[PDB]
Design a protein around this nucleic acid. Structure first.
Ligand SMILES: [Mg+2]
Ligand SMILES: [Mg+2]
Ligand SMILES: [Mg+2]
Ligand SMILES: [Mg+2]
Ligand SMILES: [Mg+2]
Ligand SMILES: [Mg+2]
Ligand SMILES: [Mg+2]
Ligand SMILES: [Mg+2]
Ligand SMILES: [Mg+2]
Ligand SMILES: [Mg+2]
Ligand SMILES: [Mg+2]
Ligand SMILES: [Mg+2]
Ligand SMILES: [Mg+2]
Ligand SMILES: [Mg+2]
Ligand SMILES: [Mg+2]
Ligand SMILES: [Mg+2]
Ligand SMILES: [Mg+2]
Ligand SMILES: [Mg+2]
Ligand SMILES: [Mg+2]
Ligand SMILES: [Mg+2]
Ligand SMILES: [Mg+2]
Ligand SMILES: [Mg+2]
Ligand SMILES: [Mg+2]
Ligand SMILES: [Mg+2]
Ligand SMILES: [Mg+2]
Ligand SMILES: [Mg+2]
Ligand SMILES: [Mg+2]
Ligand SMILES: [Mg+2]
Ligand SMILES: [Mg+2]
Ligand SMILES: [Mg+2]
Ligand SMILES: [Mg+2]
Ligand SMILES: [Mg+2]
Ligand SMILES: [Zn+2]
Lengths: 99, 208, 126, 155, 116, 60
RNA sequence: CUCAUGUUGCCAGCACGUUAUGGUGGGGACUCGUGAGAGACUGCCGGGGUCAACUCGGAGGAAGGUGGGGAUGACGUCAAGUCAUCAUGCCCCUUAUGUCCAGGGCUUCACACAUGCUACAAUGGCCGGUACAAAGGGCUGCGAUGCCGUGAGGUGGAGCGAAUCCUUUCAAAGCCGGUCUCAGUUCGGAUCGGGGUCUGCAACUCGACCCCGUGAAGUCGGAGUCGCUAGUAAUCGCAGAUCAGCAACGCU
RNA sequence: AUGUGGAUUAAUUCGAUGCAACGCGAAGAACCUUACCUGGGUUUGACAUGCACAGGACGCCGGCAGAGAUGUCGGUUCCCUUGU
C-alpha cells in the first residue's frame, strides 16, 4: 500500500477551504481514494509591542501568526492523479507540500 | 496617541491584505526586498498617484499590483516607464515578476488620492480652507461615500505655531468595526517645514 | 456505549462508565493510590453518594491538563454529567445539587502592565 | 457593594465529619493555597486534641466556638474634628467568623516549636477558658462594654 | 565532643558535626561518611573513640583544614595585594572585586549601613 | 544612525563577532526583531500599512 | 450541543504484542484537532410599576438579565515626551564638531530615594521514592541514544525547517518515609582564595556558569505608604523574545 | 542583582524624573552596539551620484617591517567597440 501525504500550508481559513475544495474535486474527478482535508492544530504565534517610542512601556499592541494546516491522505495514488495535482495551479495564499 | 489605524484594526474582518505569502526562513529577505522596492518606487513615481500596492509571490516568482487614478504616465503607450521599472526590479534581482496596473473606479472617494491631491494643491498655493472644502465637496458629490473626515495638522500658513483643526460631515463609526472605513495620510512639502494630514473615509458596511 | 467529558481550567478528562462494581481505575491506578488527598476523594465520591447508588457503576478515567485539583474536579463533573447522560430521571435532583453545571471559570488573560492576573506593581506617589 | 448584596459562595461540606465550620477553619489555615497540607495540619491538631482530652471532637469544637463566639463589635466614626468609637451588633456569621479568625491568628504565634501542637493546645485552652481567644474576647468585650453610650448615633 | 581543636557537638547529626570543623562542607561531610562507612543519622551518644581515631587519620591524610588554611589564604591575599593586581586594589579599597552593584549593594563589604 | 555606522555594520566583519541587525529600514541598534528583520516602531508602522503576511491584532 | 471528520492524534469493541508501552493489525463508538450551525432574545409567569419604559422573585436552560476577559482611547487638556527610529526649517564644522583603530570608559563609589528577588524558617530546610499543564522556538539552528567528566562542559551525533525529531515520556507544589526541636540555627546566601568550561582574534577594568574554602548582616519591621472582591489574592514552574556568548531576579 | 540622584576618574555617551522616570531606551557593553577619553593616521574621502583631466584597470590570492588601522612589494586583469 502506497500513500501520498499533502500538507496545505498557509494562513487564511477561506483560502485553505478553497484549496481543499479544488484538491478534493480533482481527486474525485480522477477517481482516487481521498479521506478529505483533515484539520490540524492551528499554530498561533503571539508578538507584543509597545505603541510609543521612548518609554510609556505600559501600553503595547498584540499580534498573531495564524497558520492553518490540513492533512489530505489520498490513498491509491493514481499516476494521472499525481500529474493532475502537479499541474494544478493554486492561489499564492496557500503552500502545497507533497510528501 | 489618540486613534489607532482603522485599517490596521480592520485587517481581519472588513479590509484585505496588500501582500500574501507565507515562508519563514527567508521571510526577512522577503520583507527586505518589499521595503526596498516600495521605497524606491515611491521615490521614483511621484507624478502619478500610486493609490495601492499588492505583492503576490510563489517560490521565485513575484507579482506586483498597483492602483493609480490614471495610468497615462504610469505606463507609456510604448512602455517607457514600464521597462524602466522592469529594469529597477531586475537590478533588485526580483527573479520572475510582472506588473499589473489598475485604475481606480472613483478617484474622489479614495483615501490616498484625495489626500495627495489636496496636499499638492496646498504645497503649491492653495489655502487650507479652499483645499479642504474642495476635497470634502468633491468627495461627498459621489453617492457612494456618505461619511468622510479629513484632518491636517501643522503650521498653517507659515505660522510659528501648529494648529489642530478639521471639518466633519456625515457618519464615521470608527468604534464600529463593521463600518467600511478607509484611512490615509501623507507628509506635505512646505518651505516653512512639514505638515501632516490624516483622512478618514467611510463607505457603507458589511453584514454577515 | 456511554461517554462524558469535562473541561474547566484546562482540566480535561475522558470518562467511561460501566454498571459493574465501583472499582476505580485512574490511568491504571486505583483512586486510593491515585492522588490520595482526603478532600479529592470526597469531591470524587460526592456525585455517586448524591445519586444514592454507590458501588453500582465502574469507571475508566483518562486525564489531561491541570494539576491534582484540576483532574479531580474534571473527573467529578464527568461522573456528574455521565449520570444524567445514562439516566435523565435524576435531572431535577442533580441540578438542584448543581453537579451538571460545570464551573466556567479558569485562568484569565494576563494583561500587560500588570505583574500577573490583575495585581499591579507597588505604588509610590513620592 | 454599592448596588447591593454580592452572592456568597456555597462552600462544600467536610465529608469525614460533616461540618462546614471545619472547612472554614481549613480555608483560614490556607496559606499559599495548599489545601491538602491545610487539611493535614487540621487533622493532626484535632487528633492531638482528641487523644489529649478524651472527648468527642465535634462536641469539643462546638463548645469552643460557643465559648469564644462574641456578640458585639465596635465601629469607629469621626465627627466634629475627632474620631469616635461606636459599637454595633453582629450576626452569628460574623461571630463565628471572628472567633475562628482569632483562634487561628493567635495559635499562629506560640513558641512551643510546633504549630500542629499549637492548634490543639489553643483549642483546649479555648474549651477550658484559658485560651488566648478567651483573652482576646475578654479585652474586646472590655472595649465594647466600656461604651454603650455612643450607641445613640445608631450608625 | 572534641575534634582537632573543634568542639564536636554533643547531640547532632555527624554530617553537621563535621561541618562544624572549618575545612568541611555538607558535600564533603556526605562523601566522608560514605567513605568511612558511618551513617548520617545516629547520635553522638554512640560515638566510639576508635571511630574518632579513624576520622582523624582520614582527615589528616586527605585534607587541609584550620590553621593551614588560614596561613595559605592569608599568604595568597598578601601576595596578590603586594603584586598590584586589581584584586589587591579592591582588597585595599575595601570593595568587592567581582564587580557587583557596588553602588547600591555591596553593603556586606562596606559594613553596616553608615549614613553621611 | 550614521551612514558610516550603517556601512560598517553591513560590511563583512573581520570576525564573526561583529554582527548585528541594525534594522535595515532605519538601522536601530536596539529594539530590532530578527524574524521580521525590522525595528520595533518600524514593524508597527509597516503593520498599520497592512502589507505583511500574518500580522494582525491579538485578543483572547 | 449537532454536523463533517481519523493521522504524527484517540479507542468503544475484536486479535497479535509478551515486557515497553495503542507497541503493532484493526475501528469514530468520545475528547482530541477546526470548519458550519444552534443556543440568552426578559424567551415565559407574578408583583408592582402612568399599561410606558424597568425592578425583584419563579420554571427552562450552561450561563438571566452588558454570562467572563481582551482589542476597541469623543471633542480636548498638559507648548507633556520623543530633531538619538525616521524625515523635516534655521543656524553652526568642513580641513573639521567628518573618517578609521594608535586602547580604555560607558557598571566606576563616602551616601538616599524607585521597583523586585532571596529569606528571615517547622504549613519548613535537607535526604530517597513518587503523578499530573499549556503554549511555544528550532539552519551556517534546535539538537537523540552513547561515552568521558560532581557539573559547567568535550567526543561523537540519529530526527527535525518540522501534531512526527530536539526543547527531557516538558515539569514544580502535590503524596510517602528519615534528620533537624527552635540555634544567627542542618535556616541563610552574599563577600572573599584556589582550581575549569563555554562564546570569542583576545575574558585585568569588563561576562556568564561549575567545584572547594569563605560564614558577615539580618528575628515580620518606625510614621506613612501599594495592590487585591473569583480561579481574584497568594504561592510554584514554564516558554517567546534582544543574543555568540552572557550582569535576564527584567518584559511578555 | 540592576535602574535612579550624587561624588571621583582622561572617559564614567546620551535621552527619560511625581500620579503619567527609575530592572524606564538597555529584550544580553571583552573588540562592534560605542554617539566619550589618552592613545597612530586619514583625508573628494569608509561610504554613493554627476562634470572635467590620465588609465585598462578596478577588481582578486600570499611574504616581509608593525601593538593594530599604516603604507611597500609578489599572483590575475577588464566586458562592449571606436562612442563610450
Ligand atoms: Mg515595569
Ligand atoms: Mg496566572
Ligand atoms: Mg510605573
Ligand atoms: Mg552580536
Ligand atoms: Mg529592525
Ligand atoms: Mg479507538
Ligand atoms: Mg472626549
Ligand atoms: Mg510640545
Ligand atoms: Mg541632534
Ligand atoms: Mg535631520
Ligand atoms: Mg524631522
Ligand atoms: Mg563605553
Ligand atoms: Mg556601556
Ligand atoms: Mg549604564
Ligand atoms: Mg517612580
Ligand atoms: Mg532556600
Ligand atoms: Mg523526589
Ligand atoms: Mg515520575
Ligand atoms: Mg488550550
Ligand atoms: Mg553520566
Ligand atoms: Mg528562630
Ligand atoms: Mg546559608
Ligand atoms: Mg546555607
Ligand atoms: Mg533578624
Ligand atoms: Mg501602624
Ligand atoms: Mg466588582
Ligand atoms: Mg519564589
Ligand atoms: Mg537573546
Ligand atoms: Mg543620557
Ligand atoms: Mg524623577
Ligand atoms: Mg524588574
Ligand atoms: Mg567597531
Ligand atoms: Zn525599522
Amino acid at each position: 500500500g502506497q500513500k501520498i501525504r499533502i500538507r496545505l500550508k498557509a494562513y487564511d481559513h477561506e483560502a485553505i477551504d478553497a484549496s481543499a475544495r479544488k484538491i478534493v474535486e480533482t481527486v474525485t474527478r480522477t477517481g482516487a481514494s481521498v479521506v478529505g482535508p483533515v484539520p490540524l492544530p492551528t499554530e498561533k504565534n503571539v508578538y507584543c509591542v509597545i505603541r510609543s517610542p521612548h518609554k510609556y512601556k505600559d501600553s503595547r499592541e498584540h499580534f498573531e501568526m495564524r497558520t492553518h494546516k490540513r492533512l489530505i491522505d489520498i490513498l491509491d495514488p493514481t499516476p494521472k492523479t499525481v500529474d493532475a495535482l502537479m499541474r494544478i495551479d493554486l492561489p499564492a495564499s496557500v503552500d502545497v507540500n507533497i510528501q | 496617541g489618540q486613534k489607532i489605524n482603522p485599517h490596521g484594526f480592520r485587517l481581519g474582518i472588513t479590509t484585505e491584505w496588500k501582500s500574501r505569502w507565507y515562508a519563514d526562513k527567508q521571510y526577512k529577505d522577503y520583507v527586505k526586498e518589499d521595503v526596498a522596492i516600495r521605497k524606491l518606487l515611491a521615490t521614483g513615481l511621484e507624478r502619478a498617484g500610486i493609490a495601492d500596492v499588492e505583492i503576490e509571490r510563489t517560490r521565485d516568482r513575484v507579482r506586483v499590483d498597483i492602483h493609480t487614478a490614471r495610468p497615462g504616465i504610469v505606463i507609456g503607450r510604448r512602455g517607457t516607464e514600464a521597462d524602466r521599472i522592469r529594469a529597477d526590479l531586475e537590478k533588485l534581482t526580483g527573479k520572475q515578476v510582472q506588473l499589473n496596473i489598475l485604475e481606480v473606479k472613483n478617484p474622489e472617494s479614495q483615501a490616498q488620492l484625495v489626500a495627495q491631491g489636496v496636499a499638492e494643491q496646498l504645497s503649491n498655493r492653495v489655502a487650507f480652507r479652499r483645499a479642504m472644502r474642495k476635497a470634502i465637496q468633491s468627495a461627498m458629490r459621489q453617492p457612494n461615500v456618505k461619511g468622510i473626515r479629513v484632518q491636517c495638522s501643522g503650521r498653517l500658513g507659515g505660522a510659528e505655531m501648529s494648529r489642530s483643526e478639521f471639518y466633519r460631515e456625515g457618519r464615521v463609526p470608527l468604534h464600529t468595526l463593521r463600518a467600511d472605513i478607509d484611512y490615509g495620510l501623507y507628509e506635505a512639502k512646505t518651505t516653512f517645514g512639514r505638515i501632516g494630514v490624516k483622512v478618514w473615509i467611510y463607505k457603507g458596511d458589511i453584514v454577515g | 456505549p456511554i461517554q462524558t467529558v469535562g473541561r474547566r481550567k484546562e482540566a480535561v478528562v475522558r470518562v467511561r462508565l460501566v454498571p459493574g462494581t465501583g472499582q476505580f481505575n485512574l490511568d491504571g491506578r486505583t483512586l486510593e493510590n491515585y492522588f490520595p488527598n482526603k478532600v479529592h476523594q470526597q469531591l470524587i465520591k460526592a456525585p455517586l453518594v448524591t445519586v444514592d447508588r454507590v458501588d453500582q457503576f465502574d469507571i475508566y478515567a483518562h486525564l489531561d491538563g491541570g494539576g491534582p485539583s484540576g483532574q479531580a474536579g474534571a473527573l467529578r463533573l464527568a461522573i456528574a454529567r455521565a449520570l444524567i447522560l445514562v439516566q435523565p430521571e435524576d435531572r431535577p435532583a442533580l441540578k438542584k445539587a448543581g453537579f451538571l453545571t460545570r464551573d466556567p471559570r479558569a485562568i484569565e488573560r494576563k494583561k500587560y502592565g500588570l505583574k500577573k492576573a490583575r495585581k499591579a506593581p507597588q505604588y509610590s506617589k513620592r | 457593594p454599592r448596588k447591593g448584596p454580592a452572592p456568597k459562595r456555597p462552600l462544600v461540606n467536610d465529608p469525614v465529619y460533616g461540618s462546614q465550620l471545619v472547612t472554614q477553619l481549613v480555608n483560614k489555615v490556607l496559606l499559599e493555597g495548599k489545601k491538602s497540607l491545610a487539611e493535614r495540619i487540621v487533622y493532626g491538631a484535632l487528633e492531638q486534641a482528641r487523644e489529649k482530652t478524651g472527648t468527642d471532637p465535634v462536641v469539643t469544637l462546638k463548645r469552643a466556638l460557643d465559648n469564644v463566639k462574641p456578640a458585639l463589635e465596635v465601629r469607629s466614626r469621626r465627627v466634629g474634628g475627632a474620631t469616635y468609637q461606636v459599637p454595633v451588633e453582629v450576626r452569628p456569621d460574623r461571630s463565628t467568623t471572628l472567633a475562628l479568625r482569632w483562634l487561628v491568628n493567635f495559635s499562629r504565634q506560640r513558641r512551643e516549636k510546633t504549630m500542629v501542637e499549637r492548634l490543639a493546645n489553643e483549642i483546649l485552652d479555648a474549651s477550658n477558658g484559658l485560651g488566648a481567644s478567651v483573652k482576646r474576647r475578654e479585652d474586646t468585650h472590655k472595649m465594647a462594654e466600656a461604651n454603650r453610650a455612643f450607641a445613640h448615633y445608631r450608625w | 565532643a572534641r575534634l582537632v581543636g573543634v568542639d564536636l557537638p554533643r547531640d547532632k547529626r555527624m554530617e553537621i558535626a563535621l561541618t562544624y570543623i572549618y575545612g568541611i562542607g555538607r558535600t564533603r561531610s556526605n562523601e566522608i561518611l560514605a567513605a568511612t562507612g558511618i551513617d548520617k543519622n545516629m547520635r553522638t551518644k554512640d560515638l566510639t573513640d576508635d571511630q574518632v581515631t579513624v576520622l582523624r587519620d582520614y582527615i589528616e591524610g586527605n585534607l587541609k583544614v584550620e590553621g593551614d588554611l588560614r596561613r595559605e589564604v592569608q599568604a595568597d591575599i598578601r601576595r596578590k595585594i603586594e603584586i598590584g593586581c586589581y584584586q589587591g586594589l579592591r582588597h585595599r579599597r575595601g570593595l568587592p572585586v567581582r564587580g557587583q552593584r557596588t553602588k547600591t549593594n555591596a553593603r556586606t563589604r562596606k559594613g553596616p549601613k553608615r549614613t553621611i | 544612525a550614521k551612514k558610516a555606522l550603517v556601512h560598517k555594520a553591513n560590511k563583512k566583519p573581520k570576525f564573526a563577532v561583529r554582527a548585528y541587525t541594525r534594522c535595515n529600514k532605519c538601522g536601530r541598534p536596539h529594539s530590532v526583531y530578527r524574524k521580521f528583520g525590522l525595528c520595533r516602531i518600524c514593524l508597527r508602522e509597516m503593520a498599520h500599512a497592512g502589507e505583511l503576511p500574518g500580522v494582525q491584532k491579538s485578543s483572547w
